[PDB]
Design a protein around this ligand. Structure first.
Ligand SMILES: *[C@@H]1O[C@H](CO)[C@@H](O[C@@H]2O[C@H](CO)[C@@H](O[C@@H]3O[C@H](CO[C@H]4O[C@H](CO)[C@@H](O)[C@H](O)[C@@H]4O)[C@@H](O)[C@H](O[C@H]4O[C@H](CO)[C@@H](O)[C@H](O)[C@@H]4O)[C@@H]3O)[C@H](O)[C@H]2NC(C)=O)[C@H](O)[C@H]1NC(C)=O
Ligand SMILES: CC(C)(C)CC(C)(C)c1ccc(OCCOCCOCCOCCOCCOCCOCCOCCOCCOCCO)cc1
Ligand SMILES: *[C@@H]1O[C@H](CO)[C@@H](O[C@@H]2O[C@H](CO)[C@@H](O)[C@H](O)[C@H]2NC(C)=O)[C@H](O)[C@H]1NC(C)=O
Ligand SMILES: *[C@@H]1O[C@H](CO)[C@@H](O[C@@H]2O[C@H](CO)[C@@H](O)[C@H](O)[C@H]2NC(C)=O)[C@H](O)[C@H]1NC(C)=O
Ligand SMILES: *[C@@H]1O[C@H](CO)[C@@H](O[C@@H]2O[C@H](CO)[C@@H](O)[C@H](O)[C@H]2NC(C)=O)[C@H](O)[C@H]1NC(C)=O
Ligand SMILES: *[C@@H]1O[C@H](CO)[C@@H](O)[C@H](O)[C@H]1NC(C)=O
Lengths: 341, 338
């Protein structure tokens, strides 16, 4: 599964039903789909030329770049799928260099080196090592040049970026608002806000947690921003937008951002309560509702949040927002986020 | 679960992404192109509204000015019903709806939910009912109404005072090379071609409410002098509402009704960069009042293709673009100051 290559036509054209207006309507415009919560991946990354990429790497290798960290899971999946190919490319040209791709657990961190146009390894992702520290790795060096048709999925071809930026690739971003529901999204983030008495964040699904910055061009309601109010941190591709807020909550810099997939919404973790209490503990690291031993922590408080509570759902269970604390300071087997972003 | 209650569902072809995708999300359509006839306003309570009106008149509100063409059509269509309801309550008061020509100006008064014998809706600027004593932007859409012919939307009186355009009917979105700010009468399009910039805008009428920041893209660090469509004319405070070489078209042909903006030459005309060209002025039509064509145009420091308006009486150029020949032959120029 990695085949190599080697009616306004700028717009979407089709039909949809608008459930709110209760109208079936055809024509042209902009259609944003939910691709984060989709069964398969409709999209796969590809290099414009594997040979080109191999050249990019060996060059960066000469200039002392020991490896790379992917921007996203999709990018990782490319490096994973194209490594054997890149390696036979180097091998057959007499280049003493092999690409090595390690499993990625947790958030995709940024790095400061950049691949440019044109030991003996190039290490993609993995744990932090003294041998190949992040500071000598490349990150966010590629972007989408063109899209390629496929039967099963659609191809995205990567070129080398012309400049140095921390911005997420805008080619794959879809932001939209209609019927007072607002969506900031790309291939791995789906962030939904809605008007109900007030405008506020309602739900978010993060396929992984990345470290690029959400571009202003693709951001709604981005005036008069106070970053410390932004639920999802801008250092974690949180859109710098007033939609990325919830009354009674500040930036979740210590949310469980290193668990892999994270779903944010506002409801109670199963079998728990949350109470307003001026005697509750101050905000701290996001905390799970099950201990290491597995037992359920039922009673929770908050000093000044609003209900329903900010809830995180991950592979290992349910967590609460930073402002929500265990009512009883007696449980010692806590599982808490050790992130600071 | 709520995502069903407010979303769109269907299929579309995305040429840019070379794919056919189905699913759920937000589909923003092109409505200023023929779809204004498939949407009607109706007051949610003609009875209540009548009471609201007789109260406002009783408090020194001589009349009203519609936010938009669609609102005006509702007034035109409900006045007979309103009047006959005012009769039944024994109220010396009748609604008068005059033709609306030009831009839909704003007014400072508001209706509330709780001399002459008339309530004048729209029209020219009388002194028997000045704009300063009229209400404006007191209505918003409560819910939508199913129809085969048209989608109905029912209006409530606003609980609050604001210059903001009703947000319920706004659709704003960006994907691939394309950014749209739109509602039922405005379609404002910008595109990424080397740079993000305004490419085209169609305005069914020119209104004077303000485009809400909640539905504005790229709204950070705004220099209002660079916004092409003025914020006083529902221009979005967006860096998408910009074109290099051009500043705010405060003196556009905004009083002509329908206006379309794009970047292209007026038929039979040329535009050349000249250091000796005149400075920004009111926008000028390519035909003179008699009906003669002006062919030669200059600009000092605009970029090309030229900023172009099209209205019901012809083609016009942006404020920076000036007739190269000084033998001024009674031009037709915008008199609007926005
Ligand atoms: C969209 O936004 C609206 C608000 O604009 C939300 O509506 C609110 O929903 C919440 C719960 O979902 C409601 O809160 C509940 O109120 C019940 C009755 O209200 C009492 O308190 C008010 C205080 O102002 C008094 O005025 C009133 O007379 C009543 O005495 C309570 O019975 C509920 O209590 C539960 O929670 C508390 C929390 O501590 C527990 O201690 C209780 O034991 C009990 O379990 C609760 O407080 C609120 O009333 C709604 N407001 C309005 C205006 O309707 C919608 O929920 C939101 N939509 C979505 C989808 O989220
Ligand atoms: O349209 C209505 C069908 O119902 C929607 C079901 O989901 C559709 C999702 O799209 C995937 C379609 O699956 C079939 C794959 O083909 C895609 C388009 O077919 C073009 C094939 O052309 C062959 C090229 O030579
Ligand atoms: C690209 O820009 C980034 C940030 O704008 C640069 O990252 C900084 O690099 C220096 C030295 O490498 C560090 O001390 C900083 O902490 C980095 N800031 C970050 C990572 O936010 C990066 O060096 C630039 N890369 C190139 C090739 O110019
Ligand atoms: C009360 O309001 C009515 C409706 O606006 C006024 O009637 C108009 O008066 C002007 C005066 O020049 C005429 O040109 C219009 O033709 C009248 N409208 C008609 C006949 O439908 C009336 O003058 C006002 N009375 C006042 C201010 O005392
Ligand atoms: C997108 O912008 C490019 C400029 O980068 C436009 O290309 C120019 O097109 C005009 C007329 O077609 C030519 O006179 C120029 O010489 C072109 N420039 C270059 C560098 O080729 C292009 O027309 C724009 N396309 C759209 C659809 O707006
Ligand atoms: C509406 O609000 C504006 C902004 O404060 C104010 O200037 C205006 O007088 C208000 N009008 C009414 C009728 O309250």
């Amino acid at each position: 599964x990695x085949x190599x290559x080697x009616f306004q036509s700028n717009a979407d054209t089709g039909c949809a039903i608008d459930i709110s207006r209760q109208e079936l309507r055809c024509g042209s415009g902009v259609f944003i789909h939910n691709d984060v919560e989709a069964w398969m991946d409709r999209y796969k990354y590809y290099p414009e030329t594997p040979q080109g990429l191999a050249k990019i790497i060996q060059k960066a290798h000469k200039e002392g770049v020991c490896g790379l960290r992917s921007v996203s899971r999709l990018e990782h999946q490319m490096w994973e799928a194209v490594k054997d190919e890149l390696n036979t490319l180097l091998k057959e040209n007499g280049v003493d260099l092999s690409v090595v791709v390690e499993k990625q657990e947790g958030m995709y961190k940024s790095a400061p080196k950049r691949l440019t146009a044109t030991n003996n390894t190039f290490v993609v992702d993995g744990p932090e090592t003294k041998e190949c520290p992040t500071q000598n790795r490349a990150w966010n060096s590629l972007e989408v040049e063109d899209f390629g048709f496929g039967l099963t999925s659609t191809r995205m071809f990567l070129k080398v970026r012309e400049s140095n930026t921390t911005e997420c690739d805008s080619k794959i971003i879809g932001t939209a608002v209609k019927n007072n529901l607002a969506i900031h999204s790309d291939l791995s983030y789906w962030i939904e806000s809605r008007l109900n008495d007030t405008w506020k964040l309602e739900r978010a699904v993060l396929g992984e947690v990345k470290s690029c910055t959400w571009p202003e061009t693709h951001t709604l309601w981005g005036d008069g921003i106070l970053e410390s109010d932004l639920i999802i941190p801008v250092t974690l591709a949180g859109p710098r937008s007033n939609h990325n807020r919830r009354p009674g909550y500040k930036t979740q810099n210590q949310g469980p951002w290193d668990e892999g997939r994270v779903e944010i919404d506002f409801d109670y973790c199963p079998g728990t309560t949350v109470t307003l209490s001026e005697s509750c503990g101050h905000r701290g690291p996001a905390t799970r509702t099950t201990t290491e031993s597995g037992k359920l922590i039922t009673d929770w408080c908050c000093r000044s949040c609003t209900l329903p509570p900010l809830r995180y759902q991950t592979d290992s269970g349910c967590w609460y927002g930073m402002e929500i604390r265990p009512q009883r300071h007696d449980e010692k087997t806590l599982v808490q986020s050790q992130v600071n972003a």
